[PDB]
From Swiss-Prot, chain B:
Stated name of the protein: Serine/threonine-protein kinase mTOR
Ligand binding (Mg(2+)): 524, 538
Modified residues (Phosphothreonine): 345, 354
Effect of residue 396 to Y: In FCORD2; also found in a colorectal adenocarcinoma sample; somatic mutation; increased TOR signaling
Annotated tissue distribution: Expressed in numerous tissues, with highest levels in testis.
Organism per entry: Homo sapiens
Residues annotated as binding ATP: 346, 348, 366, 368, 371, 406, 419-421, 426, 526, 537
Segments annotated as TPR repeats: 79-111, 112-151, 152-186
From Swiss-Prot, chain C:
The protein, known as: Target of rapamycin complex subunit LST8
Cross-link (Glycyl lysine isopeptide (Lys-Gly) (interchain with G-Cter in SUMO1)) at residue(s): 306
Listed PROSITE patterns: WD_REPEATS_1, WD_REPEATS_2, WD_REPEATS_REGION
Gene name in the database record: MLST8
UniProt GO MF annotations: protein serine/threonine kinase activator activity; protein-macromolecule adaptor activity
Coiled coil: none
Organism of this sequence: Homo sapiens
From Swiss-Prot, chain D:
UniProt-annotated location(s): Cell membrane; Endoplasmic reticulum membrane; Early endosome membrane; Late endosome membrane
Protein encoded by which gene: MAPKAP1
Expression tissues: Ubiquitously expressed, with highest levels in heart and skeletal muscle.
Function of the molecule: Component of the mechanistic target of rapamycin complex 2 (mTORC2), which transduces signals from growth factors to pathways involved in proliferation, cytoskeletal organization, lipogenesis and anabolic output. In response to growth factors, mTORC2 phosphorylates and activates AGC protein kinase family members, including AKT (AKT1, AKT2 and AKT3), PKC (PRKCA, PRKCB and PRKCE) and SGK1. In contrast to mTORC1, mTORC2 is nutrient-insensitive.
Summary of subunit composition and partner proteins: Component of the mechanistic target of rapamycin complex 2 (mTORC2), consisting in two heterotretramers composed of MTOR, MLST8, RICTOR and MAPKAP1/SIN1. The mTORC2 core complex associates with PRR5/PROTOR1 and/or PRR5L/PROTOR2. Contrary to mTORC1, mTORC2 does not bind to and is not sensitive to FKBP12-rapamycin. Interacts with MAP3K2. Interacts with ATF2. Interacts with MAPK8. Interacts with GTP-bound HRAS and KRAS; inhibiting their activity. Interacts with IFNAR2.
Modification Phosphoserine occurs at: 30
Similarity annotation: Belongs to the SIN1 family.
Domain comment quoted from the record: The CRIM domain forms a ubiquitin-like fold with a characteristic acidic loop, which recognizes and binds AGC protein kinase family members substrates.
Protein name: Target of rapamycin complex 2 subunit MAPKAP1
Processing and modification events after translation: Phosphorylation at Ser-30 by PKC promotes relocalization to the perinuclear region, where the mTORC2 complex specifically mediates phosphorylation of SGK1.
S-S bonds: none
């Protein structure tokens, strides 16, 4: 309830700014959560950082279940801004782990702006070099509707994932399920089918 | 030249002299001797196959082959099972000939000893030969093996000792008695343990239950007093020697009066034929059956103190842990046996036995009765062979293809011990657990199928197809993928496990097809929750028997349903699956000789054809040819030869064709 | 009381058979046929008896009188029955047992012993007698067509294309051509026989008409042998001339909304004696009555509780 | 009241001894009535 004072500054600039902001965020979240275990652990967390880093998911999920509609709206807006606005590897990893831990819970994935932000999150995934999450996100994208762009994204992500056979299967599916010869030769380029490209 | 013209009396001398020249030109080259001996044996096979539409020209062709096989193993030195199998079969076929006798005797003493470890079971099945010479050679060879390596021989020998036929058991007694002189206490200890823990397998009253369960059907279907006499005589034969433990004594106390008066009545009958006697004996037997059958389900736990007083008081022994014994590693002796036996409820009631060995490491096992396991040993050896084949190839080895295996040891004619794979899980429980967790009914597909049509099981195939599709498309089958992903710690290992699952499933599918494996219901398959690999069991229905049975004859090569399909990869089955299938089929097709020889040794055993034979070897021949067509690409019609991709695609289309999936047995779960 | 020039009888999963006339779409009598399902139903020329055939029993129901029980039955076969039919003068009935054979049962209660069987190596699905009661047509799951005469006891077998399951076989009483369809939409039309001399039975494959992308369910000629109706598993029936195999009519029950998901197949259809009105039978628990030209429905039955599989319709010789 | 139905099974070895009789017993080959007649939808006109 007292915790909105920490986000709506919108003035953190460099990597250290956001590290300290996350640190104080965890301190606030862990200090008051109405559960004695985490409340006790907070005081030591003030002294030791890594243990608090390992415990972010618990504090977030605990406090979230007590946050109400509008306050959760503020939280998700602020967290989306922090995601799309920053590029440091550690914080992106923190957010990705947070989301993936939510999606295995029973309360469902955290609702983002649009389709749980699965397009946005995958966007961030490639740049932090965590690629299995990227593939799984592209899977979630694919089940809805097949489009050429996502197919090429699959081709590229499998290529960097050292799995040529997945790329060959994507190619076969593209020929026999789209089947309009929209295939631009750069597809074969990535597939190393040089004769086809010729 | 052989690929050009095939075989005739004309090309044979030319290729013979070609290869002999090659040998004389290298003399130190495995491949040359290999080709020479193979060609000699093939010519012998031809000349045997032609004459039935002068055994000396045959003989002069055979002897050089044998010399070649001996020469070849002397050069192989690392993995040579195939050549050994061929020399063993030539031994068995023409070992009576005096001219064969020498070549064999120099070859056997010339070669090293450990080489026979790969064929120890195969020899023992033929110990009951009808020819004195071959049997004598067998005796010397086995004696030598035992005196050098006792442990790798003791278990099947004590198996053969407690046989039923005369020559088998008496030859077994002769060899075993020759064995004890240098090592006796081991023989006593093993004999005690084997003859004891077999009693734990089939307890007295279950055995009696099985006997009468059989005899009732026998009498009511065949009207043969004699058949049921042989059925239930040995039970009394073992009865009258007296109980030995508390459980058997209690059984006697309960039932023995009835059990012996029925016997006196049946004897009274067989003296003078008139049903007025045996009616009473049958009524008493059936009363006993009703009494016994009321309590079988309650049987849940056994304590050794009540069942076998001798086992729990060992506390040390000289046997290695059965089934795990390697010539290149020091043995691990069995240290103790736990006093508790847990019974897994089923129609077969296997026991969960546990031992503790020398180095403080547990060995959990599964004690099976009521079954044969000898076929399983041979198929496990074959799978090990194919694993070796995949081991030595660069394109496959980078992709990490193998078949996970487990320990198998046959203890007697109708019981044995199977290793327990840790962390494994039956697919049936997985879908069951996930569905009950989401509060979803188990057999929803079947309920829908019955709701739209009650007489589901009598419709015509097209009607079955219409309803089958209407059922499947009505329920979005995606359970396995969500199940697996929810059961993953992190996404990366999730992807790795998915990869492993795909690759493992493909190779097992192809090998199952090439074998003739059947009955792939979701209770016969298991998954490793740790590595995600796939595991097969229940190797009883082999050589395409199930596709030739009468009731519910399956028309599918192997299991590939939507639940396996959708959960594997987003594109479908045209990703990893097809490419790995290509690779594996090629690798198999290029060593056709090895697998062909191993399976040929499999089939020809006179004591394993009981399941599949109900001249006399004609049906055997008729499967064997099929196997070669499966390696030759001539299955659909042997007048043309497709490539690997064509056979692969035709098999794939066969597997996932709706019109075929409808005909399967309902419990097979085609809807999954 | 079904004593009327025009009759309508339908069957399905509801263990009963429904009767009515195309007067107001209202049924008169339902007769009990329990514990099984029927494959083919057909009335005798005399309009004295009707035969329902399915699952090891042929059950006989009367037309004019009112009796709710299967007065006559024939049994003996081990499984379902593929197809049945009568002699046109009511001397005998032919019936093709699903498994491997086709047999004949005589209506005359005498041991004249004129019954035969013929043995084939494949399960059979469609059977069509020649209108002169001399030659017979057998179509199986394996694309093998068998022409069998009663003069001899052996059949000539032709395989136009293998591995394929042909589903229907029919001949117009005018004996003009030969049409057959397979389970993927291929339709073969052959030129007729002229050889009455020694039952040579020559046929030449004239027309390959590709249509019916889905499974093909049934094909019909016309009693005047001018018109040909086909049912397809994609919920349509398409209607052709025999002259040049032209596109005459097409009837569809795809509602245009994905809320059905193919709740039914147009399994069977029947012409009228004038060859101009039809009755479509669907598995959607109800049946429809159309005319070959207008394309719009005229009549409707919906009285069943489960799907509708097979129907029998005869009218007066008039028209 | 149960006994009201009539059933016949199948007897094999049928006409396996007399072939001359069946050579013409069913060999009528009545192939005629090619002549067609016109119609006006009588019963259906009653329907409409």
């Amino acid at each position: 309830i007292n915790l909105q004072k920490a986000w709506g500054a919108a003035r953190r600039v460099s990597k250290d700014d956001w590290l300290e902001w996350l640190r104080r965020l965890s301190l606030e979240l862990l200090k008051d959560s109405s559960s004695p275990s985490l409340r006790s652990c907070w005081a030591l967390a003030q002294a030791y950082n890594p243990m608090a880093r390992d415990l972010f998911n618990a504090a977030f999920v605990s406090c979230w279940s007590e946050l109400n509609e509008d306050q959760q709206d503020e939280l998700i807006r602020s967290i989306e801004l922090a995601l799309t606005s920053q590029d440091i590897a550690e914080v992106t990893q923190t957010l990705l782990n947070l989301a993936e831990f939510m999606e295995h819970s029973d309360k469902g994935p955290l609702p983002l702006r649009d389709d749980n932000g699965i397009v946005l999150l995958g966007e961030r995934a490639a740049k932090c070099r965590a690629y299995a999450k990227a593939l799984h996100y592209k899977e979630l994208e694919f089940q809805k509707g097949p489009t050429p762009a996502i197919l090429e994204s699959l081709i590229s992500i499998n290529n960097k994932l050292q799995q040529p056979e997945a790329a060959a299967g994507v190619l076969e599916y593209a020929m026999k399920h789209f089947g309009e010869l929209e295939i631009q030769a750069t597809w074969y380029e990535k597939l190393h089918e040089w004769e086809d490209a010729l | 030249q052989l690929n050009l013209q095939g075989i005739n009396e004309s090309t044979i001398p030319k290729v013979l002299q070609y290869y002999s020249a090659a040998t004389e030109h290298d003399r130190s080259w495995y491949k040359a001797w290999h080709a020479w001996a193979v060609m000699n044996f093939e010519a012998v096979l031809h000349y045997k196959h032609q004459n039935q539409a002068l055994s000396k020209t045959l003989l002069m062709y055979t002897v050089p082959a044998v010399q070649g096989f001996f020469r070849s193993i002397s050069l192989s030195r690392g993995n040579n099972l195939q050549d050994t199998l061929r020399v063993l079969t030539l031994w068995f076929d023409y070992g009576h000939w005096p001219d064969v006798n020498e070549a064999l005797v120099e070859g056997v003493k010339a070669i090293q000893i450990d080489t026979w470890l790969q064929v120890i079971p195969q020899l023992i099945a033929r110990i009951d030969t009808p020819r004195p010479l071959v049997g004598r050679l067998i005796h010397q060879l086995l004696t030598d093996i035992g005196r050098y390596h006792p442990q790798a021989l003791i278990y099947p020998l004590t198996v053969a000792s407690k046989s039923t036929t005369t020559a088998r058991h008496n030859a077994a007694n002769k060899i075993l008695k020759n064995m004890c002189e240098h090592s006796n206490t081991l023989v006593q200890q093993a004999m005690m343990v084997s003859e004891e823990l077999i009693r734990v397998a089939i307890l007295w009253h279950e055995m009696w239950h099985e006997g009468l369960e059989e005899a009732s059907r026998l009498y009511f279907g065949e009207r043969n007093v004699k058949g049921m006499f042989e059925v239930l005589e040995p039970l009394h034969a073992m009865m009258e020697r007296g109980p030995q433990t508390l459980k058997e004594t209690s059984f006697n106390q309960a039932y023995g009066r009835d059990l012996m008066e029925a016997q006196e009545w049946c004897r009274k009958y067989m003296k003078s034929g008139n049903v007025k006697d045996l009616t009473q004996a049958w009524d008493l037997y059936y009363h006993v059956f009703r009494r016994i059958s009321k309590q079988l389900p309650q049987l849940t736990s056994l304590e050794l103190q009540y069942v076998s007083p001798k086992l729990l008081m060992c506390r040390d022994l000289e046997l290695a842990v059965p089934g795990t014994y390697d010539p290149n590693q020091p043995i691990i002796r069995i240290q103790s046996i736990a006093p508790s036996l847990q019974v897994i409820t089923s129609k077969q009631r296997p026991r969960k036995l546990t031992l503790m060995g020398s180095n403080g490491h547990e060995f959990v096992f599964l004690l099976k009765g009521h079954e044969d396991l000898r076929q399983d040993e041979r198929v496990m050896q074959l799978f090990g062979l194919v694993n070796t084949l995949l081991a030595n190839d660069p394109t496959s080895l980078r992709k990490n293809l193998s078949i996970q295996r487990y320990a198998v040891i046959p203890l007697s004619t109708n019981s044995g011990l199977i290793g327990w794979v840790p962390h494994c899980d039956t697919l049936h429980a997985l879908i069951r657990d996930y569905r009950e967790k989401k509060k979803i009914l188990l057999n929803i597909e079947h309920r829908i199928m019955l709701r739209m049509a009650p007489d589901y099981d009598h419709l015509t195939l097209m009607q079955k197809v219409e309803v089958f599709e209407h059922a499947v498309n009505n329920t979005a089958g995606d359970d396995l993928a969500k199940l697996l992903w929810l059961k993953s710690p992190s996404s990366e290992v999730w992807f790795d496990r998915r990869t492993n699952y795909t690759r493992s499933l493909a190779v097992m599918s192809m090998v199952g097809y090439i074998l003739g494996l059947g009955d792939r219901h979701p209770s016969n398959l298991m998954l490793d929750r740790l590595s995600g690999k796939i595991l097969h069991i229940d190797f009883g229905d082999c050589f395409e028997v199930a596709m030739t049975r009468e009731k519910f004859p399956e028309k599918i090569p192997f299991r590939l349903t939507r639940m396996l399909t959708n959960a594997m990869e987003v594109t479908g089955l045209d990703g990893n699956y097809r490419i790995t299938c290509h690779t594996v089929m090629e690798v198999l097709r290029e060593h056709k000789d090895s697998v062909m020889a191993v399976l040929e040794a499999f089939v020809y055993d006179p004591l394993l054809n009981w399941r599949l034979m109900d001249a006399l070897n004609k049906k055997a021949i008729q499967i064997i040819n099929r196997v070669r067509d499966k390696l030759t690409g001539r299955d659909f019609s042997h007048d043309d030869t497709l490539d690997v991709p064509t056979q692969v695609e035709l098999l794939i289309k066969q597997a996932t064709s709706h019109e075929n999936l409808c005909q399967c047995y309902i419990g097979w779960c085609p809807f999954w | 009381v079904g004593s009327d020039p025009v009759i309508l009888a339908t069957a399905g999963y509801d263990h009963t058979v429904r009767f009515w006339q195309a007067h107001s779409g209202i049924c008169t009598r339902t007769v009990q046929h329990q514990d099984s399902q029927v494959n083919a139903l057909e009335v005798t020329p005399d309009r004295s008896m009707i035969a329902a055939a399915g699952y090891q029993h042929i059950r006989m129901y009367d037309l004019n009188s009112n009796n709710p029980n299967p007065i006559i039955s024939y049994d003996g076969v081990n499984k379902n029955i593929a197809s049945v039919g009568f002699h046109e003068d009511g001397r005998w009935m032919y019936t093709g047992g699903e498994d491997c054979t086709a047999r004949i049962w005589d209506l005359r209660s005498r041991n004249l012993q004129c019954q035969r069987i013929f043995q084939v190596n494949a399960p059979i699905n469609c059977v069509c007698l020649h209108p002169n009661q001399a030659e017979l047509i057998v179509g199986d799951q394996s694309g093998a067509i068998h022409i069998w005469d009663l003069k001899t006891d052996h059949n000539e077998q032709l395989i136009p294309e293998p591995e394929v399951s042909i589903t229907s076989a029919h001949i117009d009483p005018d004996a003009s051509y030969m049409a057959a369809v397979n389970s993927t939409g291929n339709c073969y039309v052959w030129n007729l026989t002229g050889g009455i001399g020694d039952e040579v039975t020559q046929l030449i494959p004239k027309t390959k008409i590709p249509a019916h992308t889905r499974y093909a369910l049934q094909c019909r000629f016309s009693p005047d042998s001018t018109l040909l109706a086909t049912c397809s598993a994609d919920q349509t029936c398409k209607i052709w001339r025999t002259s040049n195999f032209s596109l005459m009519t097409e009837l569809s029950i795809k509602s245009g909304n994905p809320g059905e998901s193919s709740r039914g197949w147009m399994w069977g259809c029947a012409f009228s004696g004038d060859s101009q009105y039809i009755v479509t039978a669907s598995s959607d628990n109800l049946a429809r009555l159309w005319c070959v030209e207008t394309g719009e429905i005229k009549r409707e039955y919906g009285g069943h509780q489960k799907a509708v599989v097979c129907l029998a319709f005869n009218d007066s010789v008039l028209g | 009241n149960q006994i009201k139905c009539k059933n016949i099974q199948w007897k094999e070895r049928n006409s396996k001894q007399s072939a001359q009789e069946l050579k013409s017993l069913f060999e009528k080959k009545s192939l005629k009535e090619k002549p067609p007649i016109s119609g006006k939808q009588s019963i259906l006109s009653v329907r409409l």
